[PDB]
């Protein structure tokens, strides 16, 4: 049922026999990472490594002891040895706590994996923290987003994404603790 046991190892000895021989084997994106999933370890107790990733920044590669994510059912918190999870994230705020320090990123959607060795990869597109967003323009954007209703289902889904995004942002900029 795994009938093509592929990978960085099996591709070479097929590539040794079809490619012209002075070319060395191309490297693979497995060969650039160390944080493995099925490789046992990487918890050491209560500090589990969480990698907040984004296409344009690495907002947090450091360690926390708990992570609150806004999953599609609602908010959910990742403790030390969480169950492995491919959570889809609603646009809400992400909390990373290491003790006293509690930083809040209001993300715009994406996924958030928790791996069986205990690491966590929060993977979002646009993850702006809470100070660099205003409480003003959310109302003037949501009001038109609660106004324009085309009969086109395409922009209907896009405007529904606008409604839920600005609704969570208004609830997160009103309820700043």
């Amino acid at each position: 049922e795994a009938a093509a046991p592929a990978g960085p190892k099996e591709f070479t000895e097929v590539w040794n026999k079809k490619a012209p021989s002075t070319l060395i084997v191309p490297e693979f994106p497995s060969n650039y990472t160390a944080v493995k999933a099925v490789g046992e370890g990487q918890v050491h107790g209560d500090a589990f490594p969480v990698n907040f990733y984004t296409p344009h920044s690495i907002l947090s590669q450091a360690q926390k002891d708990t992570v609150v994510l806004p999953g599609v059912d609602g908010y959910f918190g990742v403790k030390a040895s969480h169950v492995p999870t491919i959570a889809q994230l609603k646009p809400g705020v992400v909390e990373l706590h290491s003790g006293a320090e509690s930083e809040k990123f209001f993300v715009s959607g994406g996924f958030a994996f928790v791996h069986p060795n205990g690491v966590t990869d929060i993977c979002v597109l646009e993850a702006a923290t809470l100070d660099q967003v205003d409480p003003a323009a959310v109302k003037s954007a949501l009001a038109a987003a609660s106004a324009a209703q085309p009969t086109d289902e395409f922009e209907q889904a896009a405007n529904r994404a606008a409604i839920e995004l600005y609704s969570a942002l208004e609830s997160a900029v009103e309820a700043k603790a």
Partner: protein, 106 residues
């Protein structure tokens, strides 16, 4: 297909996603990306990144004595075969953006 004028201003994720959506008009079973990895200012190692199509080859290639993806408890909106349908398109987006950024820097 041929894509050009892509490093005139800069590479953005919207650009990589639109190049991805032009790729997904074809519905293949594996995508492959061929780029140079900027390891230093001397070494530019050529790489192959591969992205499996979700409900065609990803679940079968992961199936070992059962499945190796059933360890991850899904928490999607719909079922797992429609979160891998989004997850592999996302993986195409990130590996395209990173590939044409490393290739531009090298």
């Amino acid at each position: 297909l041929a894509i050009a004028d892509t490093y005139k201003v800069r590479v953005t994720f919207g650009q990589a996603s639109l190049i991805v959506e032009e790729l997904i008009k074809h519905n293949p079973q594996s995508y492959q990306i061929l780029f140079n990895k900027f390891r230093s200012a001397i070494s530019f190692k050529p790489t192959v990144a591969t992205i499996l199509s979700p409900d065609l080859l990803e679940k079968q290639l992961e199936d070992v004595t059962g499945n190796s993806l059933d360890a991850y408890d899904i928490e999607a909106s719909h079922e797992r075969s429609d979160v891998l349908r989004d997850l592999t398109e996302f993986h195409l987006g990130v590996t395209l953006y990173n590939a044409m950024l490393e290739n531009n820097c090298s």
